[PDB]
Protein backbone atom coordinates (compact mmCIF):
# COMPACT_ATOMS: atom_id res chain seq x y z
CA UNK A 1 0.00 0.00 0.00
CA UNK A 2 2.19 2.83 -1.31
CA UNK A 3 0.81 5.48 1.04
CA UNK A 4 2.89 8.43 2.24
CA UNK A 5 2.39 9.10 5.95
CA UNK A 6 2.72 12.32 7.90
CA UNK A 7 5.44 12.66 10.52
CA UNK A 8 2.54 12.68 12.98
CA UNK A 9 1.36 9.28 11.73
CA UNK A 10 4.84 7.77 11.78
CA UNK A 11 5.17 8.67 15.45
CA UNK A 12 1.84 6.94 16.06
CA UNK A 13 2.71 3.50 14.66
CA UNK A 14 6.41 3.58 15.48
CA UNK A 15 6.79 3.78 19.28
CA UNK B 1 23.11 12.59 25.62
CA UNK B 2 26.89 12.72 25.98
CA UNK B 3 27.79 15.25 23.28
CA UNK B 4 30.82 13.02 22.78
CA UNK B 5 28.61 10.19 21.45
CA UNK B 6 30.11 8.92 18.18
CA UNK B 7 27.59 9.09 15.36
CA UNK B 8 27.83 7.17 12.14
CA UNK B 9 25.88 8.99 9.46
CA UNK B 10 25.04 6.67 6.59
CA UNK B 11 23.76 7.97 3.27
CA UNK B 12 24.89 7.37 -0.30
CA UNK B 13 24.49 11.09 -1.02
CA UNK B 14 27.35 13.33 0.19
CA UNK B 15 25.32 16.49 0.47
CA UNK B 16 22.79 14.79 2.76
CA UNK B 17 25.57 13.48 5.00
CA UNK B 18 26.96 17.01 5.14
CA UNK B 19 23.55 18.39 6.12
CA UNK B 20 23.04 15.77 8.82
CA UNK B 21 26.58 16.23 10.11
CA UNK B 22 25.97 19.99 10.37
CA UNK B 23 22.56 19.59 11.99
CA UNK B 24 24.19 17.37 14.61
CA UNK B 25 26.93 19.95 15.13
CA UNK B 26 24.31 22.66 15.60
CA UNK B 27 22.88 20.39 18.24
CA UNK B 28 26.29 19.97 19.91
CA UNK B 29 27.40 16.61 18.48
CA UNK B 30 30.77 16.89 16.74
CA UNK B 31 31.87 13.27 16.85
CA UNK B 32 30.44 12.33 13.47
CA UNK B 33 31.67 9.74 10.98
CA UNK B 34 30.23 9.12 7.53
CA UNK B 35 29.58 5.96 5.54
CA UNK B 36 28.43 5.66 1.92
CA UNK B 37 26.28 2.54 2.29
CA UNK B 38 25.38 -0.38 4.50
CA UNK B 39 28.55 -2.35 3.77
CA UNK B 40 30.80 0.65 4.25
CA UNK B 41 28.91 1.34 7.47
CA UNK B 42 29.44 -2.21 8.76
CA UNK B 43 33.10 -2.11 7.77
CA UNK B 44 33.36 0.97 9.96
CA UNK B 45 31.11 -0.28 12.77
CA UNK B 46 33.30 -3.35 13.33
CA UNK B 47 35.99 -0.93 14.51
CA UNK B 48 33.63 -0.45 17.44
CA UNK B 49 33.21 2.84 19.27
CA UNK B 50 30.00 4.01 17.64
CA UNK B 51 27.07 4.90 19.86
CA UNK B 52 24.43 6.01 17.35
CA UNK B 53 23.60 5.30 13.73
CA UNK B 54 21.60 7.58 11.48
CA UNK B 55 20.95 5.67 8.30
CA UNK B 56 19.42 6.52 4.99
CA UNK B 57 17.00 3.91 3.70
CA UNK B 58 17.97 3.74 0.03
CA UNK B 59 21.62 2.98 -0.59
CA UNK B 60 23.37 0.57 -2.96
CA UNK B 61 25.25 -2.57 -1.82
CA UNK B 62 23.21 -2.75 1.37
CA UNK B 63 20.22 -0.55 2.17
CA UNK B 64 19.08 0.83 5.52
CA UNK B 65 16.71 -1.98 6.46
CA UNK B 66 19.31 -4.65 5.78
CA UNK B 67 21.87 -2.64 7.74
CA UNK B 68 19.45 -2.42 10.66
CA UNK B 69 18.66 -6.12 10.56
CA UNK B 70 22.38 -6.83 10.38
CA UNK B 71 23.14 -4.61 13.34
CA UNK B 72 20.32 -6.08 15.46
CA UNK B 73 21.54 -9.62 14.77
CA UNK B 74 25.15 -8.87 15.64
CA UNK B 75 25.88 -9.46 19.30
CA UNK B 76 28.21 -6.47 19.55
CA UNK B 77 26.10 -3.97 17.60
CA UNK B 78 22.74 -5.36 18.79
CA UNK B 79 21.90 -2.48 21.15
CA UNK B 80 22.98 0.28 18.76
CA UNK B 81 20.32 2.99 18.41
CA UNK B 82 19.44 3.31 14.74
CA UNK B 83 17.47 6.24 13.40
CA UNK B 84 16.10 5.74 9.89
CA UNK B 85 16.17 8.91 7.82
CA UNK B 86 14.40 8.58 4.51
CA UNK B 87 12.78 10.92 2.00
CA UNK B 88 9.82 8.62 1.51
CA UNK B 89 7.40 7.61 4.27
CA UNK B 90 5.59 4.54 3.00
CA UNK B 91 3.52 2.78 5.68
CA UNK B 92 5.17 -0.53 4.81
CA UNK B 93 8.65 0.72 5.72
CA UNK B 94 7.64 2.28 8.92
CA UNK B 95 6.22 -1.12 9.75
CA UNK B 96 9.23 -3.06 8.47
CA UNK B 97 11.63 -0.66 10.20
CA UNK B 98 9.77 -0.91 13.49
CA UNK B 99 9.58 -4.70 13.13
CA UNK B 100 13.32 -4.84 12.48
CA UNK B 101 13.86 -2.70 15.57
CA UNK B 102 14.50 0.82 14.28
CA UNK B 103 14.90 3.18 17.22
CA UNK B 104 13.11 5.95 15.36
CA UNK B 105 12.11 7.24 11.94
CA UNK B 106 12.47 10.67 10.35
CA UNK B 107 11.44 12.03 6.98
CA UNK B 108 13.97 14.24 5.25
CA UNK B 109 14.09 17.13 4.78
CA UNK B 110 14.07 17.75 8.52
CA UNK B 111 15.09 20.57 10.86
CA UNK B 112 17.51 20.48 13.80
CA UNK B 113 14.33 20.90 15.84
CA UNK B 114 12.77 17.69 14.50
CA UNK B 115 16.09 15.86 14.85
CA UNK B 116 16.56 17.09 18.43
CA UNK B 117 13.06 15.86 19.25
CA UNK B 118 13.69 12.39 17.80
CA UNK B 119 17.13 12.09 19.32
CA UNK B 120 15.72 13.10 22.70
CA UNK B 121 12.91 10.55 22.70
CA UNK B 122 15.41 7.83 21.80
CA UNK B 123 17.99 8.90 24.38
CA UNK B 124 15.06 8.80 26.80
CA UNK B 125 13.42 5.51 25.83
CA UNK B 126 16.91 4.10 26.32
CA UNK B 127 19.34 5.62 28.81
CA UNK B 128 21.94 7.89 27.19
MG1 LIG C 1 19.99 7.26 -0.44
Q: Which of B105, B69, B71, B100 is nearest to B88 (CA)?
A: B105
Tell me, in Å, the resolution of the deposited structure.
2.4
A10 in contact with chain B, both atoms CB, cutoff 8 A = yes
CATH number for B36: 3.40.50.2300
**CA A4, CA B88: separation in Å to the nearest integer?**
7
Residues written for chain A: 15
Partner residue facing A10 (CB), from B92, B94, B125? B94
Pairing type for strands B7-10 and B82-86 reads unpaired
Interface test with A, best of B57, B87, B107, B125 (most A CBs within 10 A): B107
Are B28 and B52 contacting, i.e. CB atoms less than 8 angstroms apart? no
Q: Which of B85, B73, B8 is nearest to B41 (CA)?
A: B8
Count the domains in chain B.
1
Instruction: Classify burial at B64, counting beta carbons within 10 Å of its beta carbon; exposed 0-12, middle 13-18, buried 19 or more.
Output: buried
Tell me chain A's radius of gyration from C-alpha atoms. 8
Are B44 and B35 contacting, i.e. CB atoms less than 8 angstroms apart? yes
Which secondary-structure segment (H or E) carries B64? helix B64-73
Angle at A9 between CA A7 and CA A13, to 5 degrees: 120
Domain range holding B123? Answer: 1-128
Size of interface A-B (CB pairs under 8 A): 35
Q: Which residues of A touch B102 (CB under 8 A)?
A: 14
Three-class SS of residue B7?
A: strand
Q: Phi, psi (5° rounding) for residue B100?
A: -70, -15
Are B20 and B28 contacting, i.e. CB atoms less than 8 angstroms apart? no
Residue B11 assigned to a binding site: yes
**CA B69, CA A12: separation in Å to the nearest integer?**
22
Amino acid sequence: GDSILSQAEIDALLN
Amino acid sequence: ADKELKFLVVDDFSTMRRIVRNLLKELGFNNVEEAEDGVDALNKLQAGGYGFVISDWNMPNMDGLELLKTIRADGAMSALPVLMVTAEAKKENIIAAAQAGASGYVVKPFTAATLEEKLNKIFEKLGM
